[PDB]
Design a protein around this nucleic acid. Structure first.
Ligand SMILES: [Mg+2]
Ligand SMILES: [Zn+2]
Ligand SMILES: [Zn+2]
Lengths: 1412, 52, 84, 213, 153, 102
RNA sequence: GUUUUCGUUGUUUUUU
């Protein structure tokens, strides 16, 4: 468009084919022969033609034009030259491949050691991949001792034995094993010989050596000519302003070419052998440095100043190289970055933009018939103020520098011209902060041109950014086309990012001043007078000019906080939440009841006005939309501004102090804890401390004292909290929740408590002491980091240093976690960059292979499901019956005649009875489906679409469903409607049977829930939906469900990546970041190998039999139980002369006299539940009777097993050392220990409800999943291995997917945060959709075989390019990365289609619209 | 390094939120925390040759 | 092999938010290029509101080529693809 | 002791082998699918507990419903190895037994090991197809794990219309490797595609299909 | 710039998947000037019931092999092993350390005099070739003398 | 008490680049030979004398890290060195440490 | 005369 005219049609790149470059084609592109190292022709401009800086290769300055193409930098595309090497050389990334191709063919005949004659080679060549077929060719060539002159029948082979090829220095050497071994004639493999053998290679051979005849060649793999870049690539780069230092590329090219000319001179001159060698190697490492100066084991080419010389390889791999630093990241224009400030009176979706930003940044508005007047006003207004044009763009492309234009206002605008209109108010702009984890960190705000040089924002919009105004720099980006403005307004706006898909919850809420105010406002004894009322009403944007009747009227009209709340609230919003089981009369003003925007009872809190699910913001999201939420934000914010401006709320020291009674309670609590600590000290120091399970004595002491002192701090803090008074702004702060919490008050007022570092206690830093002021082994709290003061009192120097320990611990934790959390995020983003739900609804890759046929198994977006309780799932079967089953014949449990006009028809009818029956057994089937399959143990509330509850209440309040009027609507109406709507739910469209099967799969839970809610019995007995009520209920349910479908084109992979990473950006069992990393690197075994063996029900209610199973699982060798070992040489084979075994061997004996003696621990035997005689028997089996065993008498003082051998000193010790470890006594190997662990497993009740059951189980340390699974009394169908790799090895890929999902689910629940199911389900399925476990490791992701443009861009780009070019691969430009590094429309979302100007609808236009 | 200035604690303007402070304009007009900044640019003649 | 028949179209009968943004931007840019106007204008000087009004009654001459993963595509006229 | 634990291991392995057959549309005498530990001990093992792998080797007819559904299904010869270390001679004897009886499908679950030299001949037992397994992973049915859903091979029409409906490619399905535990459970060779009925938390049931690749 | 003070024993626990168990390190350098002259790290081989005996072979500065410590004691003047213990053993009431240094005596038993020990060191001493046994022993003695405990002498 | 426990750089250099305390002074470097004489003043037992049986519990003495003597009555010598550093004949900065346990 | 012309290596310290 803006470019000068070119007859070349407008097209983009659709495919990229890799491969090597032939020297013939190198000249075919070489625009000029380059042989002169010397660049500047005469040091008087006009650099040397035919040199490295040949102007024919291109022009470098403003006025000069490229002699080749005819244009300068304006259009000069760069042109290439060739420099003929004096001798063929090696390519730095192909020497391993030189060895590869030298391990496959003949050194003379140049052909494969085999052909497709042998089945192995033939099947290898049937592989489509070049590299794989060639490497299998290698793998079968190594199966042959010689380069076969015949069959291992001449194949045209040379027959000479294949040399042993080794990368010997820069070149390679081949140890020819000619006619047991001949003279090893390893020699310099001159590239000429390799060229010869490559030319000998037949096209069929190179094809079966994994190569394309028309493309990348082993011949091309040998360099005969090097490419000389255009001068644009390595221009004169200013070493000092004007003085240009010659480019590193130019330096190296000069060095290489001078070495090449030296080689060219090596022939015609006297060259005594080694001179040629030295000059050739000189040229060789110069060329190598051209590709790579970073040759391993070599002092790199270095500048005379000392710094090393760079190479092309360096600038392509790294953190900010070509791909990273110029392609996937590069600077933009119409972008600004400045301070942020708070604007409480500003709207949420606006940013207060400085006049400087709104002026310098501008949008090109095309001159149209409607904007001609205002655009001309802007042009005439001036370029140095607002609003005004600074450039006016002609429709052909011409521009005018308004500031430098002395006739700035004299630019008459043509329809089709463009005017760079300065950024006005309400201009949508991209809004960016660093870092930006979640997609909610990119938000489109409306520019509000207002003075000051900061970014003025709403308070609420800052919370999702998790930023503040302590000097943060914030980023604004101005769209430059209509498409961009529309995209900003419809897909990136502030209101569009309210709800986090991560925890399917809003991102935003009322915080700070507004939150504390709304706490102070809703209270029952808040009173306002006519004047203040009227003033806020004028302040309230959502006031209709009509003030309602004050609740208080006489003896004086007074108004309450609730009515003021309802004023700011637009009507049509109802909420109701019992709080803490509060009653209907709400004496504490707790609970919650808003009716149509009017609060009945209950004080609004952050649990409802924050980002909590089901909250008021959630409610406006799912009832009214984002615009209404933006309106209510402004309403409450401005009214709170008024009300606090007029009241004010503060903090003081007296607020932070509690009366002396609680102070002394604090003191005595701390003192009592110290006394308990001293008691624990005494017990530990006299071993009176009983050992805790899995917790050693000293560490048990430390940990229990830690628990005690934390209890001290918490008890003191809770006392302080209790003494907080009503006027106390501290408890008012926490109750308001604008900031602070319980532990905060505990530390400030009562006592800080133990400074716990990485979940530990401040140790004795010095020699057995934490400070020189403390003593050796000062186990008392003061010498180990327990704070005995509060922030009010101030802290003693020792414990001040301990709090310094804790603070530095926290800061270092944050600082360290930065970098790893970062690279984790980046690699995860790289992992799943293209998962998108296609218009089919299936989740697939760019290959089309389906990951999941549907989104979240239901094809719903993470904003339309909500926690819903399926009423059927809980409830006593009797209660369930008397809630769901009808009884017409007996009026005792019948429908009451008052509610219906047809009770006489109902009484005694059978058709109605059988209909309600069929519905009842339908509900029973649903009960089975849910309680036994879908939701099994304790939970019945799940994120499902369509808010049925609110729909029912809406119908009730629209059609006045109160009173006991009789029903004009019959039961068959409800039943037919329900059966119809069950079918009306549409997810997967189409006619195939699998389409409707997937439809059923998606709609099963929703139908079951609707039945659990909308059964005829409940309809009539509770809310008796009339004609209009029922019909609109059905219509609204269908509409919401059809609006609840996933939009095809979402980048669900990146969405999942962010939604999982952002949780990890906040933080003994392996959870949190550790377990995350075990998952992500795909460690083959996790750091805590532990198998959750579930004992059988009867053993799960047993302990001692479970203990026996535990001991039979705990692997036992004598190594565990061997108390001591003392080897004798016993003088006599059949007796001894030692008191320790005399009687024992006298009793057992009734060969080599050297003695294999050892002692065993009786206590360790009984703890093992074994005896030493069975140890002797076990040695009898393992070593036969060659080492004649005994068991010494159990009554003897020493449990001795003399395994007499049958000079023998060293061998005796060797056998002793071996059999101290290689005698398996009992237990399951691979299980060092087991734990006796409870499980509160939920089981239903016979009457119909549920109840928990304590079931015992074995937490077997280590992982021998198969063996413990085979152990008797083990739930083989339930036992789990915490290493999902073991699950793949054992159960397969489906079970491994489920196991990985539950691992990550538990990790997410570890901190307590929630993440949406479907995204990390997509994660785990992608981990398993290819049948095995795929890792985020560098090679693991790089082992993929898609377009290399991604894996190379990850890291080690050069190696991936070597592999791809060696395979001459093809990139189809289907990845989004190809789009971004080629700058075209992505195939995602807005680009997931091709919107087209049509003809069928254009024909409907009036004829006047005809193009001329 | 610094000045002794008068501060009160409350939530009066609503602009005090999120690391922001509210200032008395009278003190600023009188010159409270007014300061002087100085920037030194160094320049020199150079020798391209011996006489150039 | 390319166009999925309008009845064979097994994807959503509703316009998508991505399609919303594309259609709005394209139509408003067109009328900004002095293209024919398919609706009326009261004060909507900026073309975006005119395109929005076009989308309101769905009088837009565009058609969406929703690409199927297998390779085929579904052509949906604006006026036939339901508002969402 | 050793004898009884070996007996129980073997009996459970055989039980899950016959579950292999049952899940592959092979009809089985339910009395044998209920060949409990004591009756298996009597029919197969000796008084002290010495088993009889050769007598225990039986042949399984296909269910006729599978016969019309999976057409190619012949009979299934379960035979556990006579000599634990499967030698060249022992493996050859078993393979010639399979070939002479023309056992349509023959599964050879060995005892101690199968040396690769003896595994060389297994592809050369044409026209008979041999499947080689171990007792241990057959002791407990792998697919009977609670979190493991049930899996079924798709016949010609089933897999065919599966591919046609999505307009997918056989290389465009989720993958079940040939050595996947359930793939070995489900006798899955090239192309054989399996329907998997997974529990769905957000929709109740989920259909899935993996190609044996 | 803060740096570690030299001429102090630094015993560290080497990684288990390695032949070395404990590395007794000393940056033995001239105290005056506080400048680096050399350093020495004695590495302990073997495991418990694994890796044979608890042999000790350290790489002296500028030698190309871990030479056993008993051998360098032979080379440094005290050829009998009881002298090596009199230099090491100072709590003679202990038997475990005696039986743990027994494998070191066994491996250094191939060396029974100062001449063979010095030649042993010189062979691996990274010196040039053709130096022959005499100059090899002389260079081994010098490197046992200079750059070995230079802060001592 | 030896360094400031609150002065640290930001993330990349936090914890590192540490400051002194308020009253700190650094040893400018005194000749070690006077210290050698002060130590040998107390009847030092040479390292050659150090024997497993004879010196079963004797005190091994080190200078600047170099092991330069043995003794069996170390209380008197450590007390004299402490009081002498209090006096000034020993450079007042010279560190005297007595590892009684080892 | 519309228009109209600065850069890098390395080093340190930094910024929620
Ligand atoms: Mg910031
Ligand atoms: Zn050009
Ligand atoms: Zn040949």
């Amino acid at each position: 468009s803006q470019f000068p005219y070119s007859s070349a049609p407008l097209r983009s790149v659709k495919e990229v084919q890799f491969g090597l470059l032939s020297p013939e084609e190198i000249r075919a592109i070489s625009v000029v022969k380059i042989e002169y190292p010397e660049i500047m022709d005469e040091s008087r401009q006009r650099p040397r033609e035919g040199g490295l800086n040949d102007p024919k290769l291109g022009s470098i300055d403003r006025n000069f034009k490229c002699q080749t193409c005819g244009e300068g930098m304006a259009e000069c595309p760069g042109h290439f030259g060739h420099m003929e090497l004096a001798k063929p050389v090696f390519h730095i990334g192909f020497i391993p491949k030189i060895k590869k191709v030298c391990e496959c063919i003949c050194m003379n005949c140049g052909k494969l050691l085999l052909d497709e004659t042998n089945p192995t080679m033939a099947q290898a060549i049937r592989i489509r991949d070049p590299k794989k077929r060639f490497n299998a060719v290698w793998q079968l060539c190594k199966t042959k001792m010689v380069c076969e002159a015949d069959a291992p029948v001449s194949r045209g082979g040379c027959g000479n034995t294949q040399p042993v090829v080794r990368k010997d220095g820069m070149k390679l050497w081949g140890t020819w094993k000619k006619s047991r071994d001949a003279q090893p004639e390893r020699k310099l493999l001159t590239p000429g010989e390799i060229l010869n053998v490559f030319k000998h290679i037949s096209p069929e051979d190179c094809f079966r050596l994994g190569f394309n005849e028309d493309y990348a060649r082993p011949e091309w793999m040998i360099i005969t000519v090097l490419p000389v870049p255009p001068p644009q690539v390595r221009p004169s780069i200013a070493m000092d302003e004007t003085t240009q230092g010659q480019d590193d590329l130019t330096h190296k090219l000069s060095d290489i070419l001078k070495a090449n000319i030296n080689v060219q001179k090596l022939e015609m001159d006297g060259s005594p052998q080694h001179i040629i060698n030295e000059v050739e190697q000189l040229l060789q490492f110069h060329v190598a440095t051209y590709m790579d100066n970073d040759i391993a084991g070599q002092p790199q080419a270095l500048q005379k100043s000392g710094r090393p010389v760079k190479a092309i390889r360096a600038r392509l791999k790294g953190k900010e190289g070509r791909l990273r630093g110029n392609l996937m990241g590069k600077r933009v224009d119409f972008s600004a970055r400045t301070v942020i400030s708070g604007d409480p009176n500003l709207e949420l979706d606006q940013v207060g933009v400085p006049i400087s930003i709104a002026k310098t940044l501008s949008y090109p508005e095309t001159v149209t018939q409607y904007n001609i007047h205002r655009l001309t006003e802007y042009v005439r207004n001036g370029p140095n103020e607002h609003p005004g044009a600074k450039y006016v763009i002609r429709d052909n492309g011409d521009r005018i520098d308004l500031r430098y234009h002395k006739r700035a206002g004299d630019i008459v605008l043509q329809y089709g011209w463009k005017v760079e209109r300065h950024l006005m108010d309400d201009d949508p702009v991209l809004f960016n902060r660093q870092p930006s984890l979640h997609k909610m960190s990119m938000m489109a705000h409306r520019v509000k041109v207002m003075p000051y040089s900061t970014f003025r924002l709403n308070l609420s919009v800052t919370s999702p950014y998790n930023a503040d105004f302590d000097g943060d720099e914030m980023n604004l980006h101005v769209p430059q086309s209509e498409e961009t403005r529309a995209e900003l307004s419809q897909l990136c706006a502030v209101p569009l990012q309210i709800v986090s898909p991560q925890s399917n919850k809003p991102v935003m809420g009322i915080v700070q001043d507004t939150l504390c105010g709304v706490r102070k406002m809703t209270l029952r004894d808040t009173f306002i007078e006519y004047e203040q009322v009227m003033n806020m009403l004028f302040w309230v944007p959502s006031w209709d000019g009509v003030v309602p009747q004050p609740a208080i009227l006489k003896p004086k009209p007074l108004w309450t906080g609730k009515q003021l709340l309802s004023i700011a609230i637009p009507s049509g919003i109802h909420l109701q939440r019992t709080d803490g089981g509060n009653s209907l009369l709400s004496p504490k003003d707790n609970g919650m009841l808003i009716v149509d925007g009017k609060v009945m009872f209950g004080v609004v809190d952050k649990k409802t006005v924050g980002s909590g699910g089901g909250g008021l913001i959630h409610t406006v999201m799912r009832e009214k939309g984002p615009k209404i939420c933006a309106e209510l934000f402004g309403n409450i914010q401005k009214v709170v501004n008024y009300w606090l401006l007029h009241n004010g709320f503060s903090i003081g020291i007296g607020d932070a102090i509690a009366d002396a009674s609680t102070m002394k309670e604090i003191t005595h609590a701390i003192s009592s804890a110290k006394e308990q600590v001293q008691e624990i000290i005494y017990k530990a120091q006299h071993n009176e401390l009983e050992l805790k399970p899995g917790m050693t004595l000293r560490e048990s002491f430390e940990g229990e004292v830690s628990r005690t002192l934390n209890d001290a701090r918490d008890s003191a803090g809770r006392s302080a909290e209790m003494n907080l008074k009503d006027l106390n702004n501290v408890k008012q702060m926490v109750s308001a929740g604008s900031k602070g919490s319980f532990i905060n008050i505990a530390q400030m007022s009562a006592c800080v408590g133990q400074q716990m570092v990485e979940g530990k206690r401040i140790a004795f830093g010095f020699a057995d002491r934490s400070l020189p002021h403390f003593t050796k082994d000062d186990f008392s709290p003061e010498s180990k980091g327990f704070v005995e003061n509060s922030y009010l009192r101030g802290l003693t120097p020792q414990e001040f240093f301990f709090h310094a320990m804790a603070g530095r611990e926290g800061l270092i934790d944050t600082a360290v976690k930065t970098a790893e959390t970062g690279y984790i995020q980046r690699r995860l983003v790289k992992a799943l960059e293209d998962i998108m739900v296609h218009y089919d609804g299936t989740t697939r890759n760019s290959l089309g292979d389906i990951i999941q046929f549907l989104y979240g198994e239901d094809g719903l977006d993470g904003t339309q499901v909500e926690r819903q309780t399926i009423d059927t799932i809980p409830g006593s079967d009797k209660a369930f019956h008397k809630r769901y089953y009808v009884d017409l014949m007996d009026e005792k449990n019948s429908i009451k005649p008052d509610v219906i006009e047809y009770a006489a028809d109902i009484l005694g009818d059978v058709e109605l009875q059988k209909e309600l029956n069929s519905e009842y057994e339908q509900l029973v089937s649903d009960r089975k489906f849910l309680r036994e399959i879908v939701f099994v143990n304790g939970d019945h509330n799940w994120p499902l679409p369509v808010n049925l509850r609110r729909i029912i209440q809406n119908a009730q309040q629209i059609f006045h469903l109160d009173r006991a009027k009789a029903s004009d609507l019959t039961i068959p109406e409800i039943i037919h409607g329900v059966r119809d709507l069950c079918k009306k739910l549409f997810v997967l469209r189409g006619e195939n049977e699998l389409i409707k099967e997937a439809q059923q799969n998606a709609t099963s839970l929703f139908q079951c829930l609707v039945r659990a809610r909308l059964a005829t019995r409940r309809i009539l007995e509770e809310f008796r939906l009339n004609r209009d009520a029922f019909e609109w209920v059905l219509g609204t349910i269908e509409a919401q469900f059809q609006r609840s479908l996933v939009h095809p084109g979402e980048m669900v992979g990146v969405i999942a990546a962010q939604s999982i990473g952002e949780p990890a950006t906040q933080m003994n069992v392996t959870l949190g970041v550790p377990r995350l990393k075990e998952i992500l690197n795909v460690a083959k075994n996790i750091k805590t190998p532990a198998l959750t063996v579930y004992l059988d029900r009867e053993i799960a209610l047993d302990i001692e039999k479970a203990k026996v199973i535990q001991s039979s699982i705990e692997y036992t060798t004598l190594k565990n139980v061997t108390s001591a070992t003392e080897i004798y040489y016993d003088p006599d084979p059949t007796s001894t002369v030692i008191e320790e075994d005399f009687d024992t061997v006298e009793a057992y004996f009734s060969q080599s006299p050297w003695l294999l003696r050892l002692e065993l621990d009786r206590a360790r035997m009984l703890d093992k539940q074994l005896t030493m005689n069975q140890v002797a028997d076990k040695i009898s089996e393992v070593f036969s009777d060659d080492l004649f065993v005994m068991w010494s008498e159990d009554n003897a003082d020493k449990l001795i097993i003399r395994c007499r051998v049958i000079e023998e000193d060293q061998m005796l010790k060797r056998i002793e050392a071996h059999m101290l470890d290689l005698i398996a006594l009992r237990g399951i190997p691979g299980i060092s220990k087991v734990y006796m662990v409870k499980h509160k497993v939920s089981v239903p009740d016979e009457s119909g409800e549920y109840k928990n059951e304590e079931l015992w189980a074995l937490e077997t340390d280590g992982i021998n999943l198969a063996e413990v699974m085979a152990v008797p009394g083990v739930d083989s169908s339930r036992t789990y291995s915490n290493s999902f790799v073991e699950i793949l090895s054992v159960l397969g890929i489906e079970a491994t997917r489920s196991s990985l999902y539950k691992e990550i689910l538990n990790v997410i629940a570890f901190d307590g945060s929630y993440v949406n199911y479907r995204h990390m389900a997509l994660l785990v399925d992608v981990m398993t959709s290819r049948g095995y476990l795929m890792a985020i490791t560098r090679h693991g992701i790089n082992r993929a075989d898609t377009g290399a443009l991604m894996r190379c861009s990850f890291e080690e780009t050069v190696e991936i390019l070597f592999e791809a070019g060696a395979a001459a691969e093809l990139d189809d430009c289907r990845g989004v990365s190809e789009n971004v590094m080629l700058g075209q429309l992505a195939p995602m979302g807005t680009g997931a289609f091709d919107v087209m100007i049509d003809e069928k609808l254009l024909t409907s236009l009036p004829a006047d619209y005809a193009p001329t | 390094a610094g000045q002794n200035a008068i501060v009160a604690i409350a939530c009066y303007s609503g602009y005090n939120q999120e690391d922001s402070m509210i200032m008395n304009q009278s003190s600023i007009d009188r010159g409270l925390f007014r300061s002087l900044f100085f920037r030194s640019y160094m320049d020199q003649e150079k020798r391209f040759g011996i006489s150039i | 092999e390319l166009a999925i028949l309008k009845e064979e179209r097994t994807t959503t009968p509703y316009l998508t938010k991505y399609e919303r943004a594309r259609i709005l931007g394209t139509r408003a840019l067109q009328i900004s290029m002095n293209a024919p106007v398919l609706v009326d204008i009261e004060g909507e000087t900026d073309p975006l509101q005119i395109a929005m009004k076009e989308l309101s009654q769905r009088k837009i001459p565009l058609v969406i080529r929703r690409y199927l993963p297998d390779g085929s595509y579904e052509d949906w006229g604006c006026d036939e693809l339901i508002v969402d | 002791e050793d004898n009884n634990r070996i007996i129980s291991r073997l009996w459970r392995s055989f039980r899950t082998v016959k579950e292999m057959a049952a899940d592959r549309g092979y009809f089985i005498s339910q009395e044998e699918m209920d060949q409990s530990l004591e009756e298996f001990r009597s029919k197969i093992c000796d008084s002290m507990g010495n088993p009889q792998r050769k007598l225990m080797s039986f042949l399984a007819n296909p269910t006729p419903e599978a016969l019309e559904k999976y057409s190619d299904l012949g009979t299934l010869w379960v035979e556990f190895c006579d000599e634990p270390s499967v030698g060249i001679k022992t493996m050859r004897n078993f393979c010639l037994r399979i070939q002479e009886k023309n056992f349509s499908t023959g599964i050879f679950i060995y005892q101690n090991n199968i040396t690769p030299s003896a595994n060389k001949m297994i592809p050369t037992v044409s026209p008979a197809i041999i499947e080689t397994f171990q007792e241990s992973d057959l002791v407990v049915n792998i697919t009977h794990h609670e979190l493991v859903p049930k899996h079924i091979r798709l016949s010609d029409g089933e897999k065919s219309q599966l591919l046609q409906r999505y307009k997918l490619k056989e290389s465009q399905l989720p993958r079940i490797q040939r050595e996947d535990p359930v793939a070995r459970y489900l006798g899955l060779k090239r192309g054989q595609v399996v329907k998997i009925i997974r529990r769905s938390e957000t929709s109740g049931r989920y259909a899935s299909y993996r190609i044996c690749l | 710039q803060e740096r570690s003070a030299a001429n102090i024993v630094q015993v560290f626990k080497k990684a288990a998947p390695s032949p070395i168990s404990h590395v007794a390190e000393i940056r033995s350098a001239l105290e005056k000037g506080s400048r680096l002259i050399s350093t020495m790290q004695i590495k302990l081989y073997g495991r418990e019931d694994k890796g044979t005996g608890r042999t000790i072979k350290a790489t002296l500065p500028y030698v190309k092999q871990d030479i056993p410590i008993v051998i360098v004691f032979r080379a440094l003047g005290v050829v009998p092993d009881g002298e090596i213990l009199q230099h090491i053993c100072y709590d003679e009431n202990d038997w475990q350390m005696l039986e743990m240094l027994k494998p070191c005596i066994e491996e250094g038993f191939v060396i029974q005099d100062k001449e063979v020990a010095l030649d042993f060191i010189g062979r691996r001493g990274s010196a040039a070739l053709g130096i022959r046994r005499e100059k090899r022993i002389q260079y081994a003695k010098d490197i046992l003398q200079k750059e070995l405990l230079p802060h001592i002498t | 008490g030896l360094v400031c426990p609150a002065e640290t750089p930001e993330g990349q250099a936090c914890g590192l680049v540490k400051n002194l305390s308020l009253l700190s002074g650094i040893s400018i470097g005194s000749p070690s030979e006077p210290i050698i004489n002060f130590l040998e003043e107390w009847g030092m037992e040479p390292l050659e004398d150090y024997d497993p049986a004879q010196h079963t519990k004797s005190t091994r003495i080190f200078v600047n890290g170099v092991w330069t003597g043995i003794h069996r009555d170390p209380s008197m010598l450590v007390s004299t060195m402490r009081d002498l550093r209090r006096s000034g004949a020993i450079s007042p900065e010279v560190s005297i440490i007595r590892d009684i346990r080892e």
